[PDB]
Ligand binder design. Structure first.
Ligand code: HEC
Ligand SMILES: *C(=O)CCCCCCCCC
Ligand code: SF4
Ligand code: F3S
Lengths: 949, 162, 58
């Protein structure tokens, strides 16, 4: 074939800031009403690519997995490219005139004007809204949250005086008592990962222990030291029992004796740790939240403070309800909303729509023609964050600016620009921001603020006051609703809300706990499964199948749900249900997957009483992980206890394998018939996981699939367990409640009659076991079995110590997937690039901008592998060689995004021959430990030890 | 068979053309036909400050009076300021002399003065080297903001030898 | 693996000499069919083989 003709287009007029081949970084922020963070945007010659974290003295809000995958919304070809009016394509001038004339009529008639939004923490946006209201006599501004937290806000407001949340510092407490907290999840915008993990490292003989009380099962439960299955009717009583101990009081708590046996212990210990303890609870009752405030004041702990309150969640379930009622009751005129989606998130949306039928000039700002854009008057085309200007105040004492990084792709207009035009203010929102920037920024205007991204503002603690908490305690103890089976709604790490309905990276991203993808489900405990005859099963092709079930509530039902029998998932008499998947407007049927459940969020309560019935058919699941338990293989995750760590020699908790010589024992690593190669000079690399800091390691996955151009595979072809992932997080349950209980059944064994029955019972996980996580990638071995058998010699090793993988000689005779004992090697099977069988972002022309040009895209028949960050470390050596310097201490660690994007300090990358780096101080430790040292493969990635107590 | 006015034949081009977007090629989707779309006005990337003086006759002598060199003595005595003058400046101005160059001998275009005639401060080079005075052009596309100051110290050493 | 480590490092000549005597020597002797009929060729080879297998057990 002739081979195509390649052309190149230089500029007519080249801008000073752009150099071809040189990446640029911009300081921006994000806040979409649910998630928020401070971050850097890496851009090419004109466009944004993979999101980095902003760490310039304001590294308080790193990006989560949902934020890292948000770039696909920018390059989504399914966006409202042009605004519509009355269902037809129209100009913005048409929109402007329509809105202005309706406002004039509302003023003349004396009607109602309502703006709807969501937690716009912005000094200048709020000011602008205030100006709108000042000019318009009858404007009400109202805030609507999908998942609400108004009970917490009421408790804080009525004590301290404002609607804000307490930003707890989990690194300043030794005893954490959690009652339905879930602070490692989405609880109050969970960003407490680093705070928690920091206190889990045994630096000396100290370690913060965690007490988990809960109905569901979550990551904080998995990361807890103690976990007590408890229903919501028990949790309320347990909270009062805690209160009576920390705060001397006599309130008649009704609680199960076995529960009291543990609740009392925890409460007494909490009390003992004066100033070093913390009570956190997620009970949807203001009275319960008030008791939490009372107890934390009594403890007077360092983790509790009102000096920097959180401005992120400021809604109200009373105001929203009033709004809905008035839309149907009275006459409401022009309603304008932005980022608000009641149809589908509102449980009473049927009445909301009937309210919409009674209002005039409904204006909705969005990215897609969703369910509310449909039922409206004007569909306004909004910009996607990187196409707009703004400013955000996450906490009480901070100010930050948001820069656009790409010029508007589609014909959009900012919400604030619309407000300025109807107010009669000349210019635009950017000019407005400039004029109002000096009110906060006392330093240099742009040069030291836009350049860095943030600005520091002082603050002060809020005054408290007298309040009858004893009364609240008696109200909570008297409160009681003990009936039948109930469910609890929750959000996921891959699915926070409906802003990522068609995001293929989050659809593919498997659940960190249940290990499944591309679907919703119902969590039922095994004790309940036996009563309802529900079950799951592994089929011949390797995937999972399971029964269907029906959920019935007061005056309603679902009629078809997909249950997963998670053994310890539910305590007893409770059901877990994820909320946020059932979307149908403006998206393809491949993305229209799952169950919504928002209709069950009656009166904004997450806890509902239900009836569960077994259905008729059977469902197939795209399940990623097969086996649930660990077979007693202590040579995989070594665990011990704190007092053993402190009092016993390493020989008793971190023992390495021995091999016999001339009637003598020696460390297995000393036996070798071959000769080694000299890698003592020139940058020998390693990589360090410590298992205490591994909470869920959620956002570490998506950042590794950002440079490396790993394609997206659908529900099928993952259902057959043939997915493409370079690093994976594991999930190991236990039988009989401990990991040491799965090592006493195995070491005590008999001959061939009992060993056919014990190894068949050790794959059924018992009730309330212990959970352990383990990140597994391709540790670049030295005596690597995947090397020697490649007939076409596509793999080799370097002097630095990698496993170099050429994508050229790999003529796919699939040997090297077999000799890897860890077996992390992903052959590709179809062509994932441009065919119509995979209609994801790799196919369409508008969505092939996420792909960086520095890493090639594989075609067919070649294998791929989690290499070390070659495309960054070959640039760090490059940028340290042109200058004439030596590479710094933390310069290798900040470039490889396998380590430079995780929340906690779990992943540590860097140099070893440099004896002053962070890796060389971790390799010389009493917890030095490799996977499978008896194999004799010499890996370059070492894990430490779980040191739970 | 292989011709020289057209590229040669290939055997199964598996990974030869690009799925990603290498910088200067032609595409279809973008605003123009290019692949080098312009950044938004008013933004600031990490490691760059905008020049705060406007164009000539009102910002020229305001830059000539009060504007200084933000370098150190370790960087001036390095010889890298001479190498940038060896590339971007001998084509019109002289190398050791002033105004003799390479192109007033060949008489391609005239009107290049010396450095004895016009008194220039160390901040008046930097305003001309970014904008140009009626026959020069913006050399900001070629040199970087750290490197225009390395040239300006070398030009002052050339005037003192004259 | 130490099975061979302690043999190669200590019994160097015994370990490899047993290969030569039980293979290389007869390889170039009992391939000629005329030599296979000679009494002294057969006796000679027989002696070497016996010594070689003694070494094997040693
Ligand atoms: C040919 C296009 C030239 C290049 C290459 C460089 N210079 Fe120049 N320069 C050129 C002309 C024709 C003039 C005079 C224009 C006029 O209207 O008089 C200049 C002027 C200068 C000056 C004096 C400016 C002043 O205000 O008096 C300086 C100090 C100067 N040029 C510096 C300079 C440097 C540092 C260059 C390398 C980047 C360079 N010139 C290149 C023509 C050309
Ligand atoms: C493009 O059409 C030219 C393909 C050249 C193939 C060369 C084959 C050589 C003999 C097997
Ligand atoms: S871990 Fe698997 S892929 Fe990495 S070197 Fe060892 S065998 Fe090869
Ligand atoms: S052994 Fe070799 S040919 Fe490819 S499948 Fe593995 S690199």
């Amino acid at each position: 074939c002739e081979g195509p003709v390649h052309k190149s287009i230089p500029y007519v007029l080249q801008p000073e800031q752009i150099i071809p081949g040189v990446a640029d970084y911009y300081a921006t922020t994000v806040f979409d009403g649910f998630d928020f963070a401070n971050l850097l945007v890496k851009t090419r010659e004109g466009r944004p690519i993979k999101i980095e974290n902003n760490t310039i003295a304001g590294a308080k809000f790193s990006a989560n997995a949902r934020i890292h995958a948000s770039i696909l919304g920018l390059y989504d070809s399914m966006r409202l490219k042009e605004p519509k009016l009355d269902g037809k394509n129209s100009s913005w001038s048409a929109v402007d005139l329509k809105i202005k004339s309706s406002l004039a009529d509302a003023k003349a008639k004396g009607g109602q004007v309502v703006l709807l939004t969501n937690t716009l923490a912005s000094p200048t946006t709020e000011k602008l809204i205030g100006e709108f209201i000042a000019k318009n006599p009858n404007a009400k501004h109202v805030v609507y949250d999908a998942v609400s937290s108004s009970d917490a806000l009421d408790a804080f407001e009525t004590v301290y005086g404002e609607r804000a949340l307490v930003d707890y510092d989990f690194s300043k407490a030794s005893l954490i008592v959690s009652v339905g907290a879930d602070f490692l999840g989405d609880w109050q915008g969970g960003g407490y990962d680093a705070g928690y993990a920091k206190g889990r490292i045994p630096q000396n003989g100290k370690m913060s222990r965690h007490f988990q009380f809960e109905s569901n099962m979550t990551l904080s439960g998995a990361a807890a030291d103690k976990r007590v299955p408890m229903t919501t009717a028990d949790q309320k009583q347990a909270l009062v029992q805690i209160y009576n101990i920390v705060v001397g009081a006599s309130v008649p708590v009704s609680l199960d004796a076995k529960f009291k046996a543990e609740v009392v212990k925890a409460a007494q210990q909490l009390k003992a740790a004066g100033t070093k303890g913390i009570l956190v609870s997620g009970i949807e009752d203001k009275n319960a939240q008030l008791l939490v405030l009372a107890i934390n004041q009594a403890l007077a702990s360092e983790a509790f403070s009102t000096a920097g309150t959180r401005q992120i969640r400021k809604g109200s379930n009373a105001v929203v309800a009033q709004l809905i009622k008035d839309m149907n009751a009275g006459s409401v005129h022009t309603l304008i909303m932005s980022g608000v989606n009641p149809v589908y998130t509102l449980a009473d949306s049927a009445s909301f729509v009937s309210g919409l039928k009674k209002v005039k000039t409904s204006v909705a700002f969005s990215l897609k023609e969703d369910e509310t854009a449909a039922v409206s008057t004007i569909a306004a085309a909004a910009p996607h964050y990187l196409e707009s200007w703004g400013d955000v105040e996450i906490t009480k004492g901070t100010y930050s600016l948001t820069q656009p990084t790409i010029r508007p792709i589609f014909d959009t207009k900012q919400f604030q620009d619309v407000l300025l035009s109807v107010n009669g203010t000349p210019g635009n929102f950017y000019d407005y921001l400039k004029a109002n920037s000096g009110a906060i920024i006392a330093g240099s205007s742009w040069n030291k603020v836009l350049h860095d991204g943030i600005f520091v503002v002082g603050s002060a603690a809020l005054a408290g006051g007298s309040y009858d908490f004893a009364g609240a305690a008696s109200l909570l103890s008297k409160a009681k609703s003990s009936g039948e089976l109930e469910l609890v709604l929750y959000t996921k790490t891959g699915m926070g809300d409906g802003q990522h309905a068609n995001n293929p990276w989050l659809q593919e991203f498997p659940d960190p706990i249940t290990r499944v993808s591309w679907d919703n489900y119902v969590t039922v405990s095994n004790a309940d499964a036996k009563k309802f005859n529900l079950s799951n099963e592994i089929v011949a092709n390797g995937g999972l199948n399971g029964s269907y079930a029906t959920i019935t509530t007061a005056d309603g039902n679902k009629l078809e749900n997909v249950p997963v029998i998670v053994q310890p998932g539910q305590a007893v008499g409770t059901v877990g249900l994820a909320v946020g998947y059932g979307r149908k407007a403006a998206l393809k049927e491949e993305m229209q997957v799952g169950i919504n459940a928002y209709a069950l969020y009656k009166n904004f309560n997450s806890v509902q009483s239900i009836t569960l019935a077994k259905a008729n058919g059977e469902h197939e699941f795209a399940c990623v992980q097969g086996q649930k338990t660990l077979m007693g293989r202590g040579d995989i995750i070594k665990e011990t206890t704190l007092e053993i760590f402190n009092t016993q020699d390493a020989k008793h908790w971190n023992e390495q394998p021995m091999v016999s010589l001339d009637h003598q024992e020696v460390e297995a690593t000393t036996v070798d018939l071959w000769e080694s190669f000299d890698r003592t000079t020139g940058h020998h690399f390693n990589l360090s996981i410590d298992l205490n800091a591994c909470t869920g390691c959620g956002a570490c996955v998506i950042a590794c699939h950002a440079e490396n151009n790993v394609p997206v595979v659908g529900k099928a072809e993952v259902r057959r367990s043939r997915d493409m992932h370079w690093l994976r997080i594991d999930r190991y349950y236990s039988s009989e409640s401990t990991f040491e209980g799965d090592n006493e059944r195995k070491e005590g064994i008999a001959g061939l009659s009992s060993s056919l029955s014990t190894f068949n019972e050790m794959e059924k996980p018992g009730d309330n076991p212990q959970v352990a996580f383990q990140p597994v990638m391709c540790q670049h071995c030295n005596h690597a079995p995947c090397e020697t058998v490649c007939p076409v010699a596509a793999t080799s090793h370097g002097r630095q110590g990698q496993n170099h993988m050429a994508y050229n000689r790999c003529v796919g005779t699939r040997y090297c997937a077999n000799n890897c004992p860890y077996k992390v090697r992903r052959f590709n099977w179809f062509l994932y690039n441009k065919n119509s069988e995979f209609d994801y972002h790799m196919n369409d022309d508008l969505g092939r901008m996420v792909l960086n040009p520095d890493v090639n895209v594989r075609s067919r028949g070649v294998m791929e592998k989690c290499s070390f960050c070659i495309q960054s470390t070959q640039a760090v050596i490059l940028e340290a060689k042109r200058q004439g310097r030596v590479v710094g201490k933390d310069e290798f660690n900040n470039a490889c995004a396998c380590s430079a994007a995780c929340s906690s300090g779990a992943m540590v990358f860097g140099d070893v021959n440099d004896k002053e780096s962070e890796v060389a101080k971790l390799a010389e430790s009493e917890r030095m430990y490799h996977l499978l040292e008896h194999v004799g493969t010499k890996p370059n990635v070492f894990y430490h030890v779980k040191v739970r107590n | 068979c292989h011709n020289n006015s057209a590229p040669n034949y290939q055997y199964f081009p598996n990974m030869y053309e690009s799925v990603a977007y290498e910088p200067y090629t032609e595409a279809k989707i973008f605003k123009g036909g290019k692949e080098g779309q312009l950044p938004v006005e008013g933004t600031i990337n990490r490691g760059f400050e905008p020049y705060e003086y406007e164009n000539s006759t009102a910002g020229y002598e305001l830059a000539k009076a009060n504007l200084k060199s933000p370098l150190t003595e370790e960087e001036k005595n390095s010889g890298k300021g001479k190498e940038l003058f060896e590339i971007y400046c001998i084509s019109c101005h002289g190398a050791a002399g002033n105004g003799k160059g390479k192109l007033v001998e060949r008489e391609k275009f005239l009107g290049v003065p010396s450095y004895k005639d016009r008194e220039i401060t160390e901040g008046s080079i930097f305003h001309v080297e970014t904008y140009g005075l009626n026959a020069m052009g913006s050399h900001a596309n070629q040199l970087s903001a750290h490197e225009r100051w390395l040239v300006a110290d070398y030009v002052l050493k050339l005037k003192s030898q004259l | 693996v130490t099975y061979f480590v302690t043999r190669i490092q200590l019994y160097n000549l015994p370990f490899f000499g047993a290969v030569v005597m039980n293979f290389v020597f007869p390889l170039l002797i009992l391939i000629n069919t005329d030599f296979k009929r000679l009494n002294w060729v057969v006796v000679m080879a027989g002696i070497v083989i016996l010594l070689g297998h003694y070494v094997d057990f040693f």
